[PDB]
Amino acid sequence: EPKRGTIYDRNMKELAVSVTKYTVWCKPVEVEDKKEAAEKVAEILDEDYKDIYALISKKNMALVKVKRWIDDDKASQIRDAKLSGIWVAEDNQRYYPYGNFAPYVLGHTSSDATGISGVEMQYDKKLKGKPGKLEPVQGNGLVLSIDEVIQHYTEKAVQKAYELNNAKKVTAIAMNPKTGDILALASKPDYDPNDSRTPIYPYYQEELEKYNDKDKIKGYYQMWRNPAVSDTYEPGSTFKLITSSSALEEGVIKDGEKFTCTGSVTVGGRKIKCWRHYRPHGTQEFKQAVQNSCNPVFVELGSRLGVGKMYDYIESFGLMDKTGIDLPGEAKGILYNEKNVGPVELATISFGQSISVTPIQLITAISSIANGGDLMQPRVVKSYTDNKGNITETVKPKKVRSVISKETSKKMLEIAESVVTEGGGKIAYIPGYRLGGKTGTAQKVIDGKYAPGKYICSFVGIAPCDDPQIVVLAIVDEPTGVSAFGSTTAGPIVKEIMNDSLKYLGVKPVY
């Protein structure tokens, strides 16, 4: 079996490496004195007698693995023990040196070192070594766009929010909007790629004993599923950045136009309420309606666009199609067919309800607003290496299309900054770093229906808005026992990741 190629972060830190280890094997029948062998092996390996005894006493199993991937020192003690029916064999370990880290990027391999999830699978052929015969050649390596420092800050912020919000799931993606490079992708609960079948979060512990042995592979695939690329969700008010960009690009907002909030608008015989319908926003300039997250104003902009223009921009921002991200099992969101869209559906779409997207779709779309209107193909793999760590080839950023003009982009970045300085994203304000973004709080869809007390809260951030270098999307899925708002659950995630990442990146503060 040949070693797989090494997977590096963008600073050439090893994230996944094939290392030559030794495994302790046993044929029970060939073991003369089982208590004696168990005690010798147990002492060498530093394991409890009763556990090693239970392994080498096994019935009807002709060949038993006693312990995988022991170091050379302990493997030499086993050999030199000269025990019967007990031996050591060379065994390639697929080792992930940062452990419970970036599992939904890296993925993992089966027993035979075949990639079965994440980058390990997507680039299985590129990573595979060339076999030897009774010497093997290590496979070519990969350099990710992922930065282990930003990934750490992302994992840390997401793990904190998961505990604090007692959430079903917390997910964050950090993107370079200029290139579409993923800097970080974290979701909790997650798994350790060093031990892909051992749940390390109670949630997955409880989910794996709702399956019999025959069907446990289904529970494993559930735990290995990348929520950033495979799950869909109604994005809430973050989609108001899409509606705003579309409205400004189409010229449907007059300069100095005042929009009046009375707390509701009637469409299709239904009242669509402002969140603050008890205390109407009254007269608003457009900037102030985004700051206020005033639903009726977005209903009006949706109507001025109509179903056709609205669906053109949704398609153009990439929200009806896979992003083409180089990870396995991407979904493509859920949207009502354009020609069956009624007035109430159109009105809700205008503020991000009755449309489902992946997190990757939504961050990719928002990144085009932060990149002069250019939609980029997201990617995780930036470069290929030989088996000695030498770069052989690097991948160019791919511009898919211009969604909006440079002028609309600049106006939107000025509006996004004002949401964080003057509006509903104030919680995420960092002095000197010109953070912009938008919050969402959306009732959760389960089996095509809106369930009660179950929300998805999100915040998308862009920094710095004068020259965007990082976009962060954080999603808190079903926060429990807390103020369930985008600002209070997800805003602190984006603020922490932005604060730590911009200082790591050396972004100069401007006060």
Added chain:
Amino acid sequence: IEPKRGTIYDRNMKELAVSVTKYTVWCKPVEVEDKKEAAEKVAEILDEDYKDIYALISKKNMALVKVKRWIDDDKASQIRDAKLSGIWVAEDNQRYYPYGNFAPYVLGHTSSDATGISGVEMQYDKKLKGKPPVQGNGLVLSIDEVIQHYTEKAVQKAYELNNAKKVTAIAMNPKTGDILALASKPDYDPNDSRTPIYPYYQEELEKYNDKDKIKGYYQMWRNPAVSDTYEPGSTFKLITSSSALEEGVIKDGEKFTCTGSVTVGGRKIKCWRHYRPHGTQEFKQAVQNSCNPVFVELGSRLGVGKMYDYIESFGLMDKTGIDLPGEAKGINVGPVELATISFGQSISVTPIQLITAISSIANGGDLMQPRVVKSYTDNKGNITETVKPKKVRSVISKETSKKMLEIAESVVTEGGGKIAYIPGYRLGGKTGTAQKVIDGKYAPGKYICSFVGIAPCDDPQIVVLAIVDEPTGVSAFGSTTAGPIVKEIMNDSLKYLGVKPVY
């Protein structure tokens, strides 16, 4: 009449800088006998505000007033044909750069009185100036406009891709010391030398009060390739290696062992790749893997004495004497400084010093004076004199030169330079990554990445130094940032130079 300057040509006699005859409208106010009637006519012809023209011709206290500068020949004979007593037109030559925003750090530009204030325009101001009208003598640059276009294109692409503070590339003919190309982004347009054409310069000029704007101008105009110093990083291992081999301190088939670190006194210098040490290495392989411990050992075997002699001999302590203005001269810790110096840290050079040093390795060991001016012409475009290639000294033997060219090729075929590999073209070179020295202190997340290429290594015809200064949002390594710049320039330039592929 300030006479026409000499024309500046590329080496294929394409015009890069030429004086063109325009016309200026003059007034002697005490002879405009019918002022606002005379100023109504001139206002239309020149299309002026009817007031701005009157205001100028009705000046009580001036013997001569310039009405409008650099007007076209139609309007010149229109003004002559109106035969007003106090108003005429005179010739007035304008400097034009037909390629516009192209090799601005080589060409430079002039002030309104046709005096050169940067680049070749200033360095050769005397040679270019006309007789007071006889047009001045012209220059033929070593610059090739085709290779310059390949260099500008590669450097602009890298500037955008890497969101860098700056990208700089020099192409040199190692046999002659001739500069084939010198480009840097951001740069400026010598046709309009005070209007920033890059956001970066738009920002840096707005930081000065209008009164103090000159420090801003001279910052936009500064040629980073001759005036800016930097820490070369591992490209310096080509100097250290050449020096080691020339002194003979490397034994034939000697093996060097990497275990992630060395001990050069109590202080232990570690390798850059101590996570997976390189193990046992032929010298070739130490250079391919850029193994720091090996170059420390080589440094120790030379001593401070011989190291500093070789550095000086390669010209790295002295100006090159390139014929451009404002060249930087450039910038204690015992065996520890000696150790770090061995791979290009705590040592600062200009890009022109470094490419000149590497060029001597690629030219059988002959250090050459670099030059941008190959020939002089008359005022009619005939060549009168060619500047001879000037050897400064032999730094190493043809033997050491051949060994170093074999190693340089192996860096690109087998080692850290693989990104730049072109089938048939025998490229060699070395990557560098350094932390940026600012006012003497290393920063955080601030790297200068570089790649020096030599091709073909069996008969070198071109050396290219590419430097990406502060790449942003991307992996900061010589190979990924600077390697594609050299590859692109080498690919386009070797075909144009008519280098035959050998498979």
